[PDB]
């Protein structure tokens, strides 16, 4: 195809592998711990640390990632982040035998490698994506994350069911390495550095970015963004990610210990939540513009409506799934409905940075992601501290905490967010 669409089809698979390597531990750890592969005697609180150690490195390299990308370009940064994560994943069955310390260190280093991949792709699209086409290209490249989350769970289940849990990490590591080879061979930083680009396509991309590169007055200076219309986005993203990361790391554990599902069924039924979330954030993108064109709705009423939906639907149906516990069908149904409704946040707070202060998208995204990674660090550990064995009441406590946090975040966003370009943002 084209060069920019080849870049978007290789970035799709790169983010597929990023998120697969992130999520495969959630299902492997179900098979790694003891009450065929090797099995370890890790208690409740230890598995919390093993699951949350990824985000301890993930939080570190998201803001430095944009700087290093503007320094050395996005191609090598993204390629080496994913290669580091894949080569480290190849070593998880070895790191688990050395102990818990080396396992959480390995997993935190994987987080370090993965944190630097979204800033790198942003840097690449800054010079590869023409403005009228930026949405389509960015969406194609970042849909790989959703697909990776959706597919890494059934695959991990199938591999753990027909083979050991070690082959999860072997399979995903070798796929990451093969992708790195493809990426290094086929991609370049800039249309000017691409080897197989056409005359007309390069001319078209360059002329599309030509004077918009002149319009970049937001480069040399950034103000003090400590404005409560931004802390609203930060608090909403934190409250969303508490539930998101808690469930992303501990849904296979819940479905094994409470609903009593086989590993294969565990993966297949843990993928439905995120498939629903993907489809819902696809359809909400259209529902939002229909709601903003059919009626005006001020572009902030749209934001707070979609955040209210996507942050109170999850809370309500999470307390519902906790209340109905030990009923496999309704529990899985409600665990699907909650994180399905959680996709309205895609046109809720998730894009309020693109209208509270555009031309600062990278800085504001880095800030909100750095502050919203903390739920990934503390949520799994809290949930494993509250639930020593299963005790459906304990998982009910966990779900009530996550739901209360979602409700608080939705209220805080709907009270304090704004929809206009802020003062300090105008060049």
Numbering used by the authors: 36 to 70, 97 to 488
Task: Show me the paper's own sentences about this structure.
The cryo-EM structures of SialinWT in the apo state were determined at 3.2-Å (pH 5.0) and 2.8-Å (pH 7.5) resolution respectively. The overall structure of SialinWT has the same fold with the recently determined cytosol-open structure of human Sialin19, with a root mean square deviation (R.M.S.D.) value of 0.5 Å. In the cytosol-open state, Phe116 on TM2 forms π-π interaction with Tyr306 on TM7 and Gln123 on TM2 interacts with Thr434 on TM11, leading to a collapse of the translocation pathway in the luminal leaflet. The interaction between Tyr335 on TM8 and Leu309 on TM7 ensures that Leu309 is in a certain conformation to interact with Val58 and Ser61 on TM1 to further lock Sialin in the cytosol-open state. Since Arg39 forms a salt bridge with Glu262 and Lys136 binds to the carbonyl of Val248, two Salla disease-causing mutations (Arg39Cys and Lys136Glu) destabilize the cytosolic opening of Sialin.
